[PDB]
Amino acid sequence: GIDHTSKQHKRSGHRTAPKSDNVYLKLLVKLYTFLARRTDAPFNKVVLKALFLSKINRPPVSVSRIARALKQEGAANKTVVVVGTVTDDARIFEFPKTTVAALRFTAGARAKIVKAGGECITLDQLAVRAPKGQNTLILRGPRNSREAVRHFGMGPHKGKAPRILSTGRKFERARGRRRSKGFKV
Amino acid sequence: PSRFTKTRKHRGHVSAGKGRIGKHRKHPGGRGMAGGQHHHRINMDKYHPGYFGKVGMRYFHKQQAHFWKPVLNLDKLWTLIPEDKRDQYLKSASKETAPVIDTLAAGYGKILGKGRIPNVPVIVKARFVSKLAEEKIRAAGGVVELIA
Amino acid sequence: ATDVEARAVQDNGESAFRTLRLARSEKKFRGIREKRA
Amino acid sequence: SKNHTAHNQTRKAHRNGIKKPKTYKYPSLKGVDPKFRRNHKHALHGTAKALAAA
Amino acid sequence: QVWGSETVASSKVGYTLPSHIISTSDVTRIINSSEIQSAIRPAGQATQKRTH
Amino acid sequence: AISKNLPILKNHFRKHWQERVKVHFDQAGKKVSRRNARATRAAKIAPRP
Amino acid sequence: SRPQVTVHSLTGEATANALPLPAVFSAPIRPDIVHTVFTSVNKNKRQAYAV
RNA sequence: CACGGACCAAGGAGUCUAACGUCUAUGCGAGUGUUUGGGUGUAAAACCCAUACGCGUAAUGAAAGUGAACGUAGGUUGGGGCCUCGCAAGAGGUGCACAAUCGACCGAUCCUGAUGUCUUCGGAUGGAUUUGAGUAAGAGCAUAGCUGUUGGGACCCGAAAG
């Protein structure tokens, strides 16, 4: 045998295809494996790997996250690319004129964009507009803003939440939470 | 789907998944939250601190109907107007016809002050009001009129 | 019907937070006025 | 040896490696003395004010 | 008038027919376009010869 | 056994709960049996609502 | 707009008036949830059994 | 030179459920869940639906209660991608997610006590090596699956007893 430096036969921990059985998503991977292998542009490798991402790693990109991203210096005429869902927002009031490319728009977001002069295209009419990724701006949504991330790492003095079912002054406030009762963690 | 469970992959292997040295037995450690401060103590001191004690006064016969006050922020305030009408007041922005927004009929017991509203005069009817959520209304030419 | 759609503005000088704050303490010091009387 | 050996413990420590603590730029200021820490708050403020007008 | 359309809305309350993830289904017809084919490096050797 | 980082659960199944469980397979049958005994009642009282 | 389908007689000959294809016939034909929604709606007519 | 096994057939042991943790798929998306019920039916199917309610969108405090923008929702350092320049190396511009750090804002705690004052109410303002399961352009709800948890006969068989 050999003196094995590192572990043998280890899968690289990245998925190479979606877990889903969506046929209308499997055709988008048949489009972007062609692009990312036969185009030297690095935009297509990004959208290829982003189509495999699970729903937890693919958070919704609200329509204010988009409208903020065009307030960058010299980025109004870009086309925004979101490889998740694009949801509406009733907290913004003026929205610019841009074309957004996305998997799934909601009903409120698709109505808001086309009202404001923009348009909504899917990720296959983007490839005829930008095969190399001309003037795109890949936005992403917040990942650590879930419910399940407030509980990761719960130990003493960490600042994380407890996994709890019902709150109130009777549930998990007494000992270890104040110096009156015992100690304070 | 029992054909997908791991009992089906465990036929043949003695001690089906549960080890041979320490077997699978009926309740080692007690039943339930037994031993919370005797032997499972350093679980409850790390993962659920705040257990094992008594804090606060008591409320005999608490009714949750008194403590009904669902909040609303200012950034969601124009949603209470219907969408085919809410833009009409945004375009015209006329002070002699400020649109009445009733928060209580929509089901809210307080209007709070998170967010910025457009500078359109509206009048808002609400049971309870925070100091910023009136300050940002009256700066917009608005009126808070209390209700009930 | 509640208050009808889109009436006019009569902004008076007093505020609604000051009213709710004063009416609360007027409830809270109901009886100590009679002890002071 | 039914009482506290340390045999096999060095094997187990070196399987997942003995990790260095990931030194970052801008380390924390939770232990530094509060007199310096209060004035460093106002020092960075007027610096950004002067670079606002630049 | 049951499932709605783009002009007639549905007789089911709050319902619009689901929308596509991808606009067309012949992916090779969008491969063989003007914009894709004029923006790719050239092909070669479906199976390549065994050197050495 | 208190085991891992999990919620503290209240499950009130320490009594003889298997004697008293009322599964509603009747949900389909009682809807027919109330739509029957309404139209029986509606024809019994003639015109009245 | 939509493709025009042909209305057939009761005897077989194609009657002249044509019908526009509706909007449901261009809905996404996704056989991965038709599989999932079938195998939990095919369970909705079961009867209980026990010993 | 430990225990079980004379041989053969058939039977024979991690199941189901209530409530949940992580992960994954799907639907919709600041919403979501039709099915307690009503309508309908080719009849325990399917199909349609009004009010409420559940969870979520707001936290904090024992409680009375208060209740989230100084700033193109901030400053810095990293940051994929995109853009500009050059044949190109490289240089500059913008920098989503995320990771460090310094602030701001809401609540509690401690302090400061301005107009006015029912003559002690009111709590503006400015603070602090304090504090929170918080804010800072929402991310959830529902259904399904493996694995894990707790109560249940609970992987099957077994006490001396009560």
3-state secondary structure chain E: CCCCCCCCCCCCCCCCCCCCCCCCCCHHHHHCCHHHHCCCCCCCCCCCCCCC
Query: Which of B107, B141, B143, B145 is CA-nearest to residue B125?
Result: B145
Tokens for B4? 């997908």
What are the angstrom distances between the C-alpha of A154 and each of A148, A165, A167, F4? 11, 15, 17, 11
Partner residues linked to A137 by β-bridges: A80
Contact between residue B92 and residue B111 where contact means Cβ atoms under 8 Å apart: no
Contact criterion met (CB < 8 Å) for E36 and A125: no
DSSP, residue by residue, chain B: --SSSTTTT-TTSSSTTT-SSS---S-TT-SSSTTTTTTSHHHHTTTSBTBSS--S---TT--TTTT---EE-GGGGGGGS-HHHHHHHHHH--STTPPEEEHHHHT-SEE---S---S---EEEESEE-HHHHHHHHTTT-EEEE--
Cα A74 to chain centroid distance, Å, stands at 24
Separation CA G47–CA F25 (nearest Å): 9
DSSP, residue by residue, G14-51: EEEEEEE--SGGGS---TTTHHHHHTTTTTTT------
Separation CA B109–CA B68 (nearest Å): 7
- Which B residues 76-115 touch A at CB under 8 Å? 76, 78-79, 90, 115
Question: Regarding beta strands G14-20 and G4-8, do their DSSP bridges make them parallel or antiparallel, or are they unpaired?
Answer: antiparallel
| First and final C-alpha spacing in chain B | 57
Separation CA B49–CA B71 (nearest Å): 30
Question: Which residue in chain A is spatially nearest to G27 when comparing CA positions?
Answer: A24
Find the chain B residues whose C-beta atoms sit closer than 8 A to any C-beta of C.
89, 95-100, 102, 105, 121, 123, 125, 128-131, 134, 138, 141-146
Separation CA F47–CA F44 (nearest Å): 9
Question: Regarding beta strands A79-86 and A136-138, do their DSSP bridges make them parallel or antiparallel, or are they unpaired?
Answer: parallel
Contact criterion met (CB < 8 Å) for C20 and B142: no
Largest CA distance in chain G: 64
Separation CA A69–CA E33 (nearest Å): 31
Question: Which residue in chain F is spatially nearest to A153 when comparing CA positions?
Answer: F5
Residue C6: left (phi > 0), alpha (psi -120 to 50), or beta? left
From residues 80-109 of B, which are strand H contacts by CB within 7 A?
Answer: none
Note the strand H nucleotides within 7 A of protein beta carbons.
Answer: 14-16, 18-31, 35-41, 43-50, 57-58, 62-69, 71-73, 75-77, 80-83, 93-103, 118-123, 128-129, 132-135, 137-141, 143-155, 158
Helix (H/G/I), strand (E/B), else coil: A105: strand
Phi, psi angles (nearest 5°) of residue G12: 135, -30
- Tell me, yes or no, whether chains C and E touch by having 3 or more C-beta pairs under 8 A: no
Separation CA F26–CA F32 (nearest Å): 10
Contact between residue A163 and residue A157 where contact means Cβ atoms under 8 Å apart: no
DSSP symbol at A180: T
Radius of gyration of chain C, Cα coordinates, nearest whole angstrom? 16
Q: Give the CA-to-C1' distance from A133 to H87 in angstroms.
A: 22
Query: Which H or E element spans position A129?
Result: none
Contact criterion met (CB < 8 Å) for F2 and B51: no
What are the angstrom distances between the C-alpha of D31 and each of A9, A38, D26, D35, D38? 46, 55, 14, 12, 13
Q: Give the CA-to-C1' distance from D51 to H24 in angstroms.
A: 49
Q: Which residues are CB-contacts of D7 (< 8 A; sequence separation ≥ 6)?
A: D1
Contact between residue A83 and residue A53 where contact means Cβ atoms under 8 Å apart: yes
Contact between residue A70 and residue A79 where contact means Cβ atoms under 8 Å apart: no
Q: Looking at the complex, does the CB of residue A181 fall below 8 Å from at least one CB of chain E?
A: no
Query: Which of G22, E23, E35 is CA-nearest to residue A120?
Result: E23
- Which single residue is written with the structure tokens 């936005």? A139
- A139 CB and strand H closer than 7 A: yes
| First and final C-alpha spacing in chain E | 68
Burial B6-45 (b: 16+ CB within 10 A, else e): eeeeeeeeeeeeeeeeeeeeeeeeeeebeebeeebeebbb
Separation CA B146–CA C3 (nearest Å): 12
Q: Looking at the complex, does the CB of residue G23 fall below 8 Å from at least one CB of chain E?
A: yes
Query: Which of A170, A99, A168 is CA-nearest to residue A137?
Result: A99
For chain D, give the number of residues: 54
From residues 1-51 of G, which are strand H contacts by CB within 7 A?
Answer: 30, 32-33, 36, 40-41, 44-45, 47
Q: Which domains does chain A have, with CATH numbers?
A: 14-145 (3.100.10.10)
Chain E residues with CB-CB distance to G24 below 8 A: 3, 17
> Pick from B52, B78, B115: which is nearest to A174 by CB?
B52
Query: Which H or E element spans position D24?
Result: none
Query: Which H or E element spans position A146?
Result: none
Q: Which nucleotide is nearest to F28 (CA to C1')?
A: H44
Tokens for E47? 């199976």
Question: Regarding beta strands A79-86 and A99-105, do their DSSP bridges make them parallel or antiparallel, or are they unpaired?
Answer: parallel
What are the angstrom distances between the C-alpha of F45 and each of A89, B103, F38, F42? 55, 46, 11, 6
Query: Which of A184, D33, B40, D5 is CA-nearest to residue F3?
Result: B40
CB atoms within 10 A of CB G47: 5
Contact criterion met (CB < 8 Å) for E41 and A39: yes
Query: Which of D40, D10, D46, D6 is CA-nearest to residue D26?
Result: D40
Contact between residue A22 and residue A58 where contact means Cβ atoms under 8 Å apart: no
Contact between residue A102 and residue A122 where contact means Cβ atoms under 8 Å apart: yes
Q: Give the CA-to-C1' distance from B25 to H34 in angstroms.
A: 45
Partner residues linked to A32 by β-bridges: none
Resolution for this experimental structure (Å): 3.4
Separation CA A35–CA A133 (nearest Å): 10
Partner residues linked to A80 by β-bridges: A100, A137
Distance from CA of G21 to the nearest CA of A (A): 22
| Helices (H) then strands (E): counts for chain C | 2, 0
A32 burial level (CB within 10 Å; 0-12, 13-18, 19+):
buried
Q: Give the CA-to-C1' distance from A182 to H103 in angstroms.
A: 34
What is the CA angle A129-A134-A136, rounded to 5? 95
Chains that touch B (3 or more CB pairs under 8 A): A, C, F
Contact between residue A178 and residue A184 where contact means Cβ atoms under 8 Å apart: yes
DSSP symbol at A136: E
Contact criterion met (CB < 8 Å) for B51 and A169: no
Contact between residue E5 and residue G23 where contact means Cβ atoms under 8 Å apart: yes
Query: Which H or E element spans position A139?
Result: none
Chains that touch A (3 or more CB pairs under 8 A): B, E, F, G
Query: Which of A96, A110, A95, A61 is CA-nearest to residue A81?
Result: A61
Q: Looking at the complex, does the CB of residue B41 fall below 8 Å from at least one CB of chain F?
A: no
Contact between residue A87 and residue A62 where contact means Cβ atoms under 8 Å apart: yes
Please compute, for residue A29, the number of CA atoms within 13 A of its CA located in the half-sphere on the CB side. Answer: 17
Query: Which H or E element spans position G8?
Result: strand G4-8
Provide the residue type at F43 as one letter: A
